[PDB]
Symmetry: D2
Subunit: 391 residues, 4 copies
């Protein structure tokens, strides 16, 4: 059982995906936002997220726009769901074919900022704390078409303005850049969690910025998602997280969480949940940015929504059991995992004391240490047995 304390959130564009892929028409009808709110509340979600254009059709008059916001607001009220994050669609409309913030056309860049400021207003009105930015069209198909340096300057210029506004309007938002390596552009700017983190460090108010890494996005480059999250945590830049499944380097599948690389899904829950001193290492929403397979109907849709929660809770349960097992505890000791936490240097020791320590070099028996095993296969086998419910 999922509790609001689990903080499971879903994008309106997830369960609402009509299943129109690059090779075929939609196989499902449109989902009414209000119905989505009731259905998610019902399956145990604590919040919902949306792109401006997911809730209000691109180009609605203010009268329509207003009406829709009012109804949505009611649904949230009745159900108790919150809106932890909002995002803006800077990829669908043809105007954004070369990007929003980094489009070579100056007018498109001005327009993309306006579109986002607007969405920031709605977000603040609904109580959202995080603005997610997915630069899906920022990038290129050909190297000579995009000056990357100029593009990074323009990405920065735009973000700096957004932070200025939020701070001045007192919205208290946090901004999360969502990395993706490719698709739809041949190559997208800020392709990995690493590139996104390095970029944020260059903004005017870096403390207001972090990343929203997605499971399948890092897997599209065959990277270890868990290891990348660990690095994001070390930097304290994990502001949000998108969970889903993928089968390596191919199109973005966005399967249910745990339906792609299952072993990494397991190490991931372990990392987020078995944080320092019992407590989770991460406190934000556990957001599912996935798609119900094109072969399913609305029944299949609700099923897949629940499978995400289910997968996360089954994995958590096994990660807990894994760590609580005295035999794992023994294997951890033998592999010296915790010894990495002890500083390499003694207290107050510097280069000179180290250079004078003959045991660290002159009298060190590299051959003898080189022969002891780490017992890593055995620890790994113990984890998988916990995952399989065999221990």
């Amino acid at each position: 059982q999922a509790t609001r304390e689990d903080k499971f959130s879903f994008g309106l564009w997830t369960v609402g995906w009509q299943a129109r892929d690059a090779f075929g028409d939609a196989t499902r009808t449109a989902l009414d936002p209000v119905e989505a709110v009731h259905k998610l509340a019902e399956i145990g979600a604590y919040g919902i997220t949306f792109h401006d254009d997911d809730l209000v059709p691109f180009g609605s008059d203010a009268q329509t726009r207003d009406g829709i916001i009012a109804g949505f607001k009611k649904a949230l009220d009745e159900t108790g769901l919150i809106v932890p994050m909002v995002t803006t669609n800077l990829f669908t409309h043809p105007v954004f074919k070369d990007g929003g913030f980094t489009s070579n056309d100056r007018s498109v860049r001005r327009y993309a900022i306006r579109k986002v400021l607007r969405q920031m207003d709605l977000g603040a009105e609904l109580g959202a704390k995080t603005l997610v930015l997915w630069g899906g069209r920022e990038g290129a198909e050909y190297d000579s078409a995009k000056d990357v340096s100029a593009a990074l300057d323009r990405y920065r210029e735009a973000l700096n303005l957004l932070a200025q506004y939020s701070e001045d309007r007192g919205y208290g938002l946090r901004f999360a850049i969502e990395p993706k390596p490719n698709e739809p552009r041949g190559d997208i700017l800020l392709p990995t969690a690493g590139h996104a983190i390095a970029f944020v460090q260059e903004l005017e108010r870096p403390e207001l910025f972090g990343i929203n890494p997605e499971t399948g996005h890092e897997q599209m480059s065959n990277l270890n998602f868990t290891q990348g999250i660990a690095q994001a945590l070390w930097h304290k830049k994990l502001f949000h997280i998108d969970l889903n499944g993928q089968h390596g380097p191919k199109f973005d599948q966005d399967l249910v969480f745990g339906h792609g690389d299952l072993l990494n899904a397991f190490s991931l829950v372990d990392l987020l949940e078995n944080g320092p001193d019992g407590a989770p290492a991460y406190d934000g929403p556990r957001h599912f940015d996935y798609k119900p397979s094109r072969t399913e109907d609305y029944d299949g849709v609700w099923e897949s929504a629940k499978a995400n929660i289910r997968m996360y809770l089954l994995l958590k349960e096994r990660a807990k059991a894994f760590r609580a097992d005295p035999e794992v505890q023994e294997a951890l000791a033998a592999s010296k995992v915790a010894e990495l936490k002890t500083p390499t240097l003694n207290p107050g020791e510097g280069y000179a004391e180290l250079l004078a320590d003959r045991s660290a070099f002159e009298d060190y028996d590299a051959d003898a240490v080189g022969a002891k095993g780490f017992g890593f296969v055995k620890l790994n086998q113990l984890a998988i047995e916990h995952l399989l419910g065999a221990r």
Copy 2:
């Protein structure tokens, strides 16, 4: 023809690779270091680099070690070759099986630092300006075997110490971390140029740290090498560069520069040479970190060394011609490449002035703008025709 001004450098371990691979014995006999200096001098190299263990066999007594250094310096002297960079082998010896700076074993970590300090002294002695650090054994095969957070702490602890020592001693070294996603470990820490840049920003004297990206390592994850270099230059962290060739995600091939992704090799040379003024955007060594194919004998080795320089100079020549062509200037103008360099905002404009601009949103005709083409294919076609010498 290569000039010293071209700054082509080679690792002793490139031409000296005996071609012992993961599945077979060495097909070439050892290359003598003095001989290497002399042959490299002859093909046009301006400098040579080496790992400690490439020059002085692991465990050589001091008399021996001393002897080799003297001979080496004499060859340097006679040919006029310099040592722009040096590195340390923290991957071959069995003691380094779980890493050097981040081994679970505390004693290996202490010994790893001592091994590098020692190599710093020699680099300082030879006039080297950069210390390259390739953390090839830092990472894991299994997620539960390595605490990433603690590993980054210990990687940082070791680098802070290295910088302290260099600065106290007045060595003037710059430190360049070299990223690699995998091999030999299942996953290596700091897998891409981005991850390495983000990491470096967290050290005690960041100004002293940068990266040494390798063409093939970014390609092992299917990333755009030119595009990652552009971001590195934007951050001003491109301290050195390793040029070679690769065919996508598979084992590290280390082919001659330009023998893998030729189009990306072309866009890379254009980026480095057709810099800001008219001047190169990058002023350091053009280092070839490649391996002569195992099927080749020493004539093949020397041929492959020259091929590296030849590919660079041929691409440079076409990159220059590309930029000088009036038809290219016209295509650049139609694709609005330079328009990206113009700030999105007018001087003195903030969010208040932007919100007041009805033309940036309320009266913006997105449909009309979305219908004009960027002419990117045509620009790409002209570039390719310059590469093929078709124009």
Copy 3:
């Protein structure tokens, strides 16, 4: 300049792609088929191809359908273009979400066969020689959802029937199966040229079936396209070929031919054209199944169509220069490329005679042989210099 003897053909869906991708709306209006015929004739194509549904909108009444065909035939008549191949759309309509021929649903399988029979009729009437079969929806997202063996039985069962019909109606069609590893299904059946050839060999009239490999599809799995086509030719199963560009394992890009892996596009043209007896090893249509980038308008569309032709002809010209070069001739000899064509055994020798030859084993000096280099790097370097027009 392109001549009709070059046999450049294009699908109506290539230049006609409106650029609606998985993440955005169409950026171009629909292309009139008659206009398409005219435009293509002007750029040098010798033929056009299409899916039933590209020409005649799904669900057109007889009258309309008839109407369309007649205008289409007129345009061909007027222009001199032929229809070398026709294919059927079994991927767009929601009914084919689980496949056409191997849908779990039997009624869909029966419907798919009917839909193809109809296209075979139109194809025969237009003079097409080849029926291309692209099983884009044949596959699965989940392993337990598709019995592969049963799917292969049903695939075979449908193809046997089509051959039967063609032969009885006297159409004289050849069938070409087009492999693709994934997209739109998580995994597609007959994922590579290899798997498709193996399958075809199990049909009732195997001499009527071959493959239609596409450059990008094999590259999506990081395979060597030229090498796979060389195997297809060895088997005599290259019934057709789709030329385009791709940048390794990622979504299907469908770039202009030679805009992806340039070195492999070069070796491919050399293989097809520099066939034995001076003559091309392949005599069918050089078909471009590519897509004008979404950033482009109709001018970029015709520009991209011409670029496909120009790329092929520039590569052809360099592949011939390469083979005609005496130094290449000398490098080929040193590499023993042609010695591979001489049988391993002397005429009349069998295992008995080989076992009696002490020189092949007992007295063989493996060590002296293993020390000689093949000069492959030098040969590669010469190929590339020819590609760069540097020789």
Copy 4:
């Protein structure tokens, strides 16, 4: 617990890998073959396999070779282990740098065949029923270095001779070609199970030839291993199987079976054991071609050997429970998996009758069928809940 009925086998080179990788020295001392026989027997293996050079050091005199073989045979006798398959090392020695059967050098091709003939004799004497052929060095790093067509001719030439010798000597061996896409050559000939199957079909006696696919090798190309295995079984060419783990496209990891893509390992075990008629679909050895991680000592080596067997048995148990679950059955029925096994055409129905059925076209409601969901997600969720031991 493994029984001899489980038919688990290991190559001497698996537990015997000294862990010398491409970047480092061995971390383990050599394993005595007799000791390996005893240890394997002890963990439950029914057989052992080996390359000629694993047992008898390359270049041993006949007296030495004969002694090794005799001691070997005694161990086999005393433990009751058998030798189900043997193989030949055609990749280690420098002489094989351009391949064995397909080296451009004629004399190497002759020597390669004699090395294999000699191993067939020893195989036949130890009772081996399968000869595995892994052409690790047959391929190229550069496209112009190898005539593929000539290479396939030579490959075929060598294989026909081997079948001939075997048949004449009454050895009754079956031959299994083992595909691999790359490593150690840039591109290896016959890269996937598909390509090997298509090739085998062209030999003089195809019935004696099949494939020895390895889990990681197909995953190196990001292909679906279970799905390719399903196709191999449909062709009846699965003569042997190598089980291991891999994490997508990167160097060959050869991890314990199930430690790579766990979900694919689970569906593979289901396919092999839950064959048609209750019984397994495959009855050959379950061979582990893996390597104990370089971080391990001999304790870790035996732990990893046992992990392979444990992994197989755990997955088998879960696969069995999966299929005996009435809810799973119900989901299978709802997903129509079995309906694929029913011919598409009715008994005696031909194209004439198909064309006459208006229910297959004229009166087919594509739109209504297209709207029904297949329930695939739900089925996948039950599969994973079984693997997790949650059901």
